[PDB]
Amino acid sequence: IQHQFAENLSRLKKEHGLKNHQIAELLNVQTRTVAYYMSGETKPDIEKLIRLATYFHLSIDELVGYVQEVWNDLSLKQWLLSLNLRSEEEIAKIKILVDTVETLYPN
Amino acid sequence: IQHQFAENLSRLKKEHGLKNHQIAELLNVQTRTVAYYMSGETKPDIEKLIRLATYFHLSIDELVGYVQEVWNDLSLKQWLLSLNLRSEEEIAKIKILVDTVETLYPN
Amino acid sequence: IQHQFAENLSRLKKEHGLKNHQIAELLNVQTRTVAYYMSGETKPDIEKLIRLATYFHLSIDELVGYVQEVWNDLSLKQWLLSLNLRSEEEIAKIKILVDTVETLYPN
Amino acid sequence: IQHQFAENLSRLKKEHGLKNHQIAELLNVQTRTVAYYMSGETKPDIEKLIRLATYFHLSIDELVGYVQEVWNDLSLKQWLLSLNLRSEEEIAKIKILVDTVETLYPN
Ligand SMILES: [Cl-]
Ligand SMILES: [Cl-]
Ligand SMILES: [Cl-]
Ligand SMILES: [Cl-]
């Protein structure tokens, strides 16, 4: 239930051989602020989590240690999953179609 | 590259028939602050993103619209993936083993 | 690179306390055939993998130990990901829209 | 509930501008057999699904249109998720530790 951002950031720092001032430089904050991230005394805003997730190639969920725990109709989930087979050109067309219809006929 | 939290929160509000004050009550903030979330004028901290993701049953990545874009050795990835087959009782034992060894013999 | 279905099925059998004849009954095959699955001498067809994945609540990828290893434009991936926020009723409408247009105007 | 491998393979063939004989060459089967895959008259074995998923960069689940639908204790799931933060060198060590202990002291 409780996230573990401070523990995770501490382990990333260790495993990557980083110093707090290097992370501070990455996020444009004080080195002191990064110390407080690590100790859990203070937490970053969404923009800072995104910069860290991008740097370390992590999902935001992995970075903060967030985990969860139902579709009524599975053939819809199956259709949605099937969009991952489409080329980017075909997905681009579907996005225009759906955006257009939503603009013209707002639910 | 740019997240779309404000757009996503706005669509969740619409599709769920929520009023800003209901979301405000959920997060223990002012209704005005929720208005600013929706317009993108201000962003929530990690604790507020987690409360929203939990409420709407979403990953934090889905909630904010974060997307990314390599293992050197795939048999390790394959091993890690294989842990998802294990019972919770067996994963609990592995966690104790690994935590213990890390405590005794800190890399 | 090489899948590990036989190793995985063997570990599932062990961790669940199953006997080969119980798995055979699940798949409507001979107990001997299940023995050959476990030893890697023979592999199941897609229908049998789906029955096993469903029984054990696993992805087919997890069940067989399959792992992989690029979007040209990430805002499309981000849009696709955003569909996971939509209600089933709204996804159902999008599916009809897209299916209809594909039927009328086949790429 | 019902997979959609034949529909998916048909759409991949279309979107990629492939001919059946090209897919046949990829899988080392007759062109006729690929025709039967597409019409759903016959299904490939796991080795052939893996070759297709690898070629098209898809999960096996995406390729066949398989979808599913609980952890008792979430802090274990959270620990397992946290392994994705580790370097490959550290995961390699954990794998040796766990494999060794399993070999010495078989549950
Ligand atoms: Cl600062
Ligand atoms: Cl407030
Ligand atoms: Cl049989
Ligand atoms: Cl053949």
Side-chain angles (χ1 to χ4, degrees), chain C residues 28-31 33:
Chain C
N28 298 116
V29 297
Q30 291 171 16
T31 295
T33 292

PDB file of all heavy atoms in Angstrom, chain C residues 28-31 33, ligand 3:
ATOM      1  N   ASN C  28      -7.826 -32.602 -21.674  1.00  0.00           N
ATOM      2  CA  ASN C  28      -8.339 -33.730 -22.452  1.00  0.00           C
ATOM      3  C   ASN C  28      -7.267 -34.379 -23.337  1.00  0.00           C
ATOM      4  O   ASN C  28      -7.439 -34.520 -24.550  1.00  0.00           O
ATOM      5  CB  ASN C  28      -9.535 -33.281 -23.294  1.00  0.00           C
ATOM      6  CG  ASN C  28     -10.681 -32.788 -22.433  1.00  0.00           C
ATOM      7  OD1 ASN C  28     -11.062 -31.618 -22.490  1.00  0.00           O
ATOM      8  ND2 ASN C  28     -11.213 -33.674 -21.595  1.00  0.00           N
ATOM      9  N   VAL C  29      -6.157 -34.763 -22.711  1.00  0.00           N
ATOM     10  CA  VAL C  29      -5.125 -35.548 -23.368  1.00  0.00           C
ATOM     11  C   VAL C  29      -4.786 -36.735 -22.465  1.00  0.00           C
ATOM     12  O   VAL C  29      -5.237 -36.801 -21.321  1.00  0.00           O
ATOM     13  CB  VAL C  29      -3.839 -34.725 -23.607  1.00  0.00           C
ATOM     14  CG1 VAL C  29      -4.111 -33.543 -24.548  1.00  0.00           C
ATOM     15  CG2 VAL C  29      -3.247 -34.245 -22.261  1.00  0.00           C
ATOM     16  N   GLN C  30      -3.967 -37.650 -22.971  1.00  0.00           N
ATOM     17  CA  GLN C  30      -3.417 -38.729 -22.163  1.00  0.00           C
ATOM     18  C   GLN C  30      -2.463 -38.194 -21.118  1.00  0.00           C
ATOM     19  O   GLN C  30      -1.783 -37.200 -21.358  1.00  0.00           O
ATOM     20  CB  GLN C  30      -2.606 -39.662 -23.037  1.00  0.00           C
ATOM     21  CG  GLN C  30      -3.391 -40.488 -24.012  1.00  0.00           C
ATOM     22  CD  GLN C  30      -2.446 -41.200 -24.955  1.00  0.00           C
ATOM     23  OE1 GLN C  30      -1.250 -41.292 -24.685  1.00  0.00           O
ATOM     24  NE2 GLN C  30      -2.958 -41.656 -26.071  1.00  0.00           N
ATOM     25  N   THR C  31      -2.367 -38.899 -19.992  1.00  0.00           N
ATOM     26  CA  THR C  31      -1.387 -38.580 -18.965  1.00  0.00           C
ATOM     27  C   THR C  31       0.029 -38.675 -19.545  1.00  0.00           C
ATOM     28  O   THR C  31       0.915 -37.912 -19.188  1.00  0.00           O
ATOM     29  CB  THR C  31      -1.548 -39.524 -17.756  1.00  0.00           C
ATOM     30  OG1 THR C  31      -2.818 -39.280 -17.134  1.00  0.00           O
ATOM     31  CG2 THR C  31      -0.427 -39.302 -16.741  1.00  0.00           C
ATOM     32  N   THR C  33       0.952 -37.870 -22.488  1.00  0.00           N
ATOM     33  CA  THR C  33       1.233 -36.684 -23.276  1.00  0.00           C
ATOM     34  C   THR C  33       1.690 -35.559 -22.364  1.00  0.00           C
ATOM     35  O   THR C  33       2.572 -34.792 -22.723  1.00  0.00           O
ATOM     36  CB  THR C  33       0.004 -36.225 -24.074  1.00  0.00           C
ATOM     37  OG1 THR C  33      -0.275 -37.197 -25.090  1.00  0.00           O
ATOM     38  CG2 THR C  33       0.265 -34.905 -24.741  1.00  0.00           C
TER      39      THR C  33
HETATM   40 CL    CL E   3      -3.087 -37.185 -26.066  1.00  0.00          CL
END
